[PDB]
Amino acid sequence: ELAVDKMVTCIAVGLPLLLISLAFAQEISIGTQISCFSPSSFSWRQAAFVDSYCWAAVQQKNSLQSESGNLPLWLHKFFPYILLLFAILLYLPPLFWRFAAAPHICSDLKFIMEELDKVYNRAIKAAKSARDPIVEQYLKTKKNSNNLIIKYISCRLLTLIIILLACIYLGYYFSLSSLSDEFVCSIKSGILRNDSTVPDQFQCKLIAVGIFQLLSVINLVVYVLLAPVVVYTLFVPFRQKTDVLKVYEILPTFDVLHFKSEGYNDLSLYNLFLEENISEVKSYKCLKVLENIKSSGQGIDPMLLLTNL
Amino acid sequence: ELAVDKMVTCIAVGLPLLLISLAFAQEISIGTQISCFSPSSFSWRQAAFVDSYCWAAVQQKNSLQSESGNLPLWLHKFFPYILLLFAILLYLPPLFWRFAAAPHICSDLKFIMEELDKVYNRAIKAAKSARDFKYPIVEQYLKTKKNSNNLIIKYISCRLLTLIIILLACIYLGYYFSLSSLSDEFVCSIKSGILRNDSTVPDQFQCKLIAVGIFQLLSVINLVVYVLLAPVVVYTLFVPFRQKTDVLKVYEILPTFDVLHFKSEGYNDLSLYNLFLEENISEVKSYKCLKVLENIKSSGQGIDPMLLLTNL
Amino acid sequence: LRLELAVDKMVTCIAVGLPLLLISLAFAQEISIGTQISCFSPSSFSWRQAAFVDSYCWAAVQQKNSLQSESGNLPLWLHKFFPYILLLFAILLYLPPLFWRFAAAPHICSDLKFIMEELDKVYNRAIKAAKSARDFKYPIVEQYLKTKKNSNNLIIKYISCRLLTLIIILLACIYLGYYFSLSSLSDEFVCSIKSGILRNDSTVPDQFQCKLIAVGIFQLLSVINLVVYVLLAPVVVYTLFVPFRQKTDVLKVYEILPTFDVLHFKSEGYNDLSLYNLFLEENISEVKSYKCLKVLENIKSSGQGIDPMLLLTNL
Amino acid sequence: LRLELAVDKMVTCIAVGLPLLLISLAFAQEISIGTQISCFSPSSFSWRQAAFVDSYCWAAVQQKNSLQSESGNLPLWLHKFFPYILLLFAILLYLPPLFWRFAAAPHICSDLKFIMEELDKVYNRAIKAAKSARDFKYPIVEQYLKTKKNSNNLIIKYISCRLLTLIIILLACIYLGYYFSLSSLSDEFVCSIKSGILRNDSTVPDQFQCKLIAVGIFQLLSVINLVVYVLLAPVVVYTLFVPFRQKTDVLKVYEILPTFDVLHFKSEGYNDLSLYNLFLEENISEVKSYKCLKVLENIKSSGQGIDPMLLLTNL
Amino acid sequence: LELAVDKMVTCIAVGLPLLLISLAFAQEISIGTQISCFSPSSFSWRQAAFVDSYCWAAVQQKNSLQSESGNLPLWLHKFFPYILLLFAILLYLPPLFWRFAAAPHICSDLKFIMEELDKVYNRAIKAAKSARDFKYPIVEQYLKTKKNSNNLIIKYISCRLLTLIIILLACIYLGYYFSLSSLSDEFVCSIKSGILRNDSTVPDQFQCKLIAVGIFQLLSVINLVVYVLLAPVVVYTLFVPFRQKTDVLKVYEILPTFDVLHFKSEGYNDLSLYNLFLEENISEVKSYKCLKVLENIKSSGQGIDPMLLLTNL
Amino acid sequence: ELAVDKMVTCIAVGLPLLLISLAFAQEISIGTQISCFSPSSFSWRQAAFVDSYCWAAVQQKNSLQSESGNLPLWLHKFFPYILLLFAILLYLPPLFWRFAAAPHICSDLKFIMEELDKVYNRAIKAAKSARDPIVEQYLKTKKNSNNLIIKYISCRLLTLIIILLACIYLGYYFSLSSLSDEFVCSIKSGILRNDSTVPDQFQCKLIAVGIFQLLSVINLVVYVLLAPVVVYTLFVPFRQKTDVLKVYEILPTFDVLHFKSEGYNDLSLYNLFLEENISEVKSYKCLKVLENIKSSGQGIDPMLLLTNL
Ligand SMILES: CC1(C)[C@@H](OC(=O)CCC(=O)O)CC[C@]2(C)[C@H]3C(=O)C=C4[C@@H]5C[C@@](C)(C(=O)O)CC[C@]5(C)CC[C@@]4(C)[C@]3(C)CC[C@@H]12
Structure with missing residues (x-):
């Protein structure tokens, strides 16, 4: 996994998880996610019922009346699981890559490195005896089929698409009239409908929303910084x-x-992976030593190769 | 385990688990799973009794009266367990096939790769001696492999059970997902036993199963992912x-x-062995060199045996 | 193959673990009293009404219309997001090392291992020639040394990760110095739960006196972090x-x-x-040939015997 | 290759683990009664109003205007920051051993291993010469040690880490002796929640009697830490x-x-x-040649036979 | 590097106070807080919590609390948990010698003695084998020297003596706790310092009782019994x-x-110390094993010494 | 450690620990270990005082009046630790066995196995050359000293003694009335003595004692099944x-x-340990292949041994 790809995966996956845990942690939270302000006459358990009812009632559109609408209400409950969904979807292409793409490029790259070491050994053996192109064709073939690289650009393209969808969602989440958590709620379905001791409507507010928006803008900034990298x-x-x-x-x-x-x-993909993993190849290291020395041009390539041994 | 099979298993198993873990977020849960609204005269502990009684009473059909029925109540109270059950059943076929079927194909595939490397070495040695037995054993082995489907029958059987369980999960999630959205509200009566003719306790309580909406929103996600996964299987x-x-x-x-x-x-x-060979054949060096020669043969400049001898 | 200079490893350890340790301290059980905010509802308010006031004002440090504070809404924002800021700095300070850990290592670790192997080989060949006297020749690694200065791209990665570390440390110093410079009375803000249907309600008072708790601890820890960071910046x-x-x-x-x-x-x-010189100076103690050669070089300070003879004796 | 003298390892273990163990004890599931502060609001105050008073006064030990204490605001600051001061001392006392192990350790080891190898080699050569008699010559290790005498930098890292350890131990002794020298009544401070809109409020009393709980445990543990540290300082x-x-x-x-x-x-x-002499005195028992030579030297106390003969017999 | 009896003495003397601390504060034995004070009924929940915490902190301030037994029994209970850990640490300190790199002081010499014994055995059988077909007692002289210096054994008996002294001090301290009546937890407490002094709604004094002290005494007697059983071993x-x-x-x-x-x-x-360590680690020496085989056979006297030696090969 | 000894240790140690952990399961435990039923006039904190006072007062015999006696009350509270004490005492002999005697038998057994492999190699080498008793004396000596086996039977005997003492204690504890957990407690010492608002006596009941007895009978059953094994x-x-x-x-x-x-x-002890660890000895394995064969008479012993190679 290319270093830039590994870091893009690490960011795009761990950032939504870290941000969930930030808001997610109990210490950060003040308490419940919703508070509804029942009347003073209401007992403790009646107020708990109002809170839990309105929490479950952000879905039932008939019960709650909000100025912004029911969609902002549903959005808040959605966000803790929505960030995890984005983390999972962003982890999926790297998983597909390692599971499928590496096996095909890994075998080919290991074979190319072995063949390069072998050709180096044979060249120095011929030079040593004097003192006393299969890999090229394979790469020429690699040019003919883009399918191996198509897996790579496909996983990268899905990563970019999911990052852009996350940026779009984050932007909508980032700009909220924040008045949605202030939407009213009425526990008057069922036998409570014509009840009189219960007031007509309660003023509920969604707890820890502001933290969600402040974290969504951070995620959006990091993601719009990450998208050019992808x-x-x-x-x-x-x-x-x-x-x-x-x-x-x-x-x-x-x-x-x-x-x-x-x-x-x-x-081209194989060229990138060779440029990355080629430092493990000893023959490449020695040849690059000779090539750098050749910048001065003092001696000669075959002599230094034979002399270097 | 084929990459597509590994990813199908990962999705079909981790998605219900991830959704279970999400449904109980330390920020999506407001508190208890049920709230019943006892009268104001009820003490704190009496209201707690009403809540817990109705929670346990979604099973006892005599106590609770719901417009949708008792089945939605059961499904709302046993929502998690069912997702874990689906995760386990979906993990079972990958566990089964991996335990027994895998090694059978592994030994055969390793033998086929060794035999291919050996035949390649012998062919180049004969060609090298020319520049200076003979039994198709692997071909006969593959001809035999055609006769018995049993090794592949394990694979298509685990895949078929995976598909059947995925379809049953889709059916359950679509059924459960398509809820009344009023069922979460059931009328409950704590009037069995000595409380039956008691007068201070009201006749019935309006209970609501909180965080059901989260269950339905997650069930539709699971259903979407599963109906996307079923064509893959x-x-x-x-x-x-x-x-x-x-x-x-x-x-x-x-x-x-x-x-x-x-x-x-x-x-x-x-056919199964053909797939596994197509996958694991890149590890075979002889296959790599032969494919190099075959790709060069597209131009047709030289000749196969000459380039093979030159391959060394 | 540590692939991390001791001073860089300690700078990373400090700059990353200190904000984490300080976060963990800011909420030690002995240190905190309870909630992060307390609002003092009237006595007539029930328990749950007071809980509503607390949670509303906690969420209302953002909504500028609800709360009226003498210092402003910015101190309130900074007081509520104390913990979040600390983690972000730790991650950003740990980000450069992660890039160095994966991207930087192939370019350097391989080269350094090759240089050490070549040095051991040249030492063995020199003592073998000396041993044969008691009874090729191409400076390949030296040619390698010329390349190091030639290509500054490998060095660029190192000074770039160090420069981002310094920039993030300076930004953290600026933020912590600002946060510690906060009024210390700015944690007390007046909050009014009077939006929506509560607006014209009469039983609810006009405004509540809320105070953000666990902020003095935040400032005392922010000054510690700032001191350690301004001590760390010269090191970077x-x-x-x-x-x-x-x-x-x-x-x-x-x-x-x-x-x-x-x-x-x-x-x-x-x-x-120069970067390779630093990494060689660090990892060269693992090289046995370097150790023996340094023994001979230190002995040469007295100048009693001779370099090739001493080497022969060592064998 | 321990690279840490037993007395130094035990001094580090004590000076670091003792403040940590004492921190962990000061908050044992059995020594903390609950919150760190209790304020005794009036009976008319609700539960949440009393919680507000507690948290306000906890945060108000800093704001000098709110609280009036007979001993002063400095004891209040010191009482609230009680556990942080011990972890800081533990960290600062761990720092010099870390600096020693991270950089100094490797340098000391290579030289000692070389000296031991050279001593074994000279012993083997001496007995081989003696064996040939029964049937080069350069003091390289002696010259190396003569050189070691010239540079005091090697023996300066060690005494510097030890000197910082001693300085931090003495500063910790001073702080703990001051803290234990507490009034033991300074944990009771009068606190007034009357800033902001509560200032002219009438239902809230003028002042509350708050007490900082679990202080006595802090002082009893600080005297233990001080005793152990003044026992440790002579060792350093x-x-x-x-x-x-x-x-x-x-x-x-x-x-x-x-x-x-x-x-x-x-x-x-x-x-x-001198440092190399200490490390040789420690690690020399691993040297077999030293063991046999010490056997001969102890036998020489009687003076029965002779040194070269005895050596030949040992073979 | 630590004799089995010493390893078990350390394990007991250290883990027993730790295990007893962990037991004293188990959820199943702790009812809740360590102190309860019984405020009046008029007191609110938080006022009663203040009384509890104040008296807990006031077992130190001798002016506030009046106890029949005295303030020392009160202070003992609070510091009892700390003492359990302090005794464990002090008892772990002497074994710290084993923890520290003092092995070479004894084992390195031991390793040399074992190597020399194997070498002398090999040379003896080689001489016997050549017969079937130098000479300096170096290890004997080394042991003769070992007799001259007791200093290495003085480290051992010093760590053992400190272990015994700390065990006896722990026995003395634990004996005291068992002896005490412990009504100490029943000692009164008065929250009347500061502005509460002339307050009238607060009663003059509260009846506080120290929780988990009976458990402390029952565990202290167990620790004392085990320690007075351990002291003869030391x-x-x-x-x-x-x-x-x-x-x-x-x-x-x-x-x-x-x-x-x-x-x-x-x-x-x-x-003598080297004799003990040799008796322990000598079973690893193969030459010792074969020689002991021959020595046991010699009890019967059926087979010759040198003959059986050579015969074993 | 012999397999039967390892399993006896595992049972006798982990069973009291598992039972302690079960006795205090979150589902299993209802809350506090004692409840005292203060009057309704008592505040929350006064009732907490009564509970804690009576909990601490199961020791002070003057305060509490119980029909069964004060000893059942002591045993109620101390039952949880007592199981840990039994677990520790049952772990002690296996611990002693590991350092005091296990190495002594380990060195001897390793030497015996090495000597057996050596004698096998020498026998087949002599047989191979034809085709072209130190260990016995050591075991004869082993017969003379029982001291090594005395360590083993001593640790086993202490294990049996502690198991029997645990059986006795658990049978006694389970033989409790199960009403002895209800004791009458009086908070009337000190200044509360002549107080009038506080009632004369409280009806306290010890929490989780039925669970203790049900677990003690399980422990007793398992222990009386384990004692014959020991x-x-x-x-x-x-x-x-x-x-x-x-x-x-x-x-x-x-x-x-x-x-x-x-x-x-x-x-005899060495015979047992040899019978256990002898399967690791390759020479023993081949000899048992052929040793059994010799009895059959299909082939001769030295010929099959030479053929074994
Ligand atoms: C801590 C919790 C929330 C709860 O805690 C738990 O449920 C366990 C989880 C946890 O503790 O975290 C247990 C109940 C309880 C301890 C509760 C209680 O007992 C009795 C009363 C009284 C009711 C009242 C108004 C009357 O009834 O007249 C008389 C005044 C008074 C004292 C007001 C406050 C409460 C409501 C009080 C103290 C608030 C705190 C409360």
């Missing part, structure tokens, strides 16, 4: 730079051909 | 349709390997 | 100027080997070579 | 006197080897040589 | 010489390459 | 059988002598 990561061809196989062109047992650029094809 | 259910890009066709260019794919068209274990 | 800066911290040339001890060219060539640049 | 001071502790010259047993020069040359300095 | 363990019998070396005397001398007994010196 | 384990000689070294008698390099039976000596 879009840049979405474009695989642009990120393919510092041609990694160019360092291998100084080997006799290796054909003089990079042939890795310019396409929305799996070859 | 049905597609995964059909093993023959999934298989393509004949993997052994790349081996047909070897002299030590008979020219025969012979892997298609059946509800038999051969 | 000190850290930012790597060219200055690259000292005690580590490869100079290897110059006494015949199989090693006589050239340090590691100094004076905002390039990856 | 003795640890500080590093040359005085360098005794029973460990290399003196090696002077009976022909392949080893007849020179101890390890004493009398605030230099890294 | 005293016996204190006497290292009386703790040594059937020395391991007496089996090596049948080797030609080993001098015929045990020379290990009768002293308050490090040699 | 008694059988107590008799080491009656347990040893299937002479394990008899399979080694078919080796030329091994003397033809079992010599392991009939004694209250450490040899």
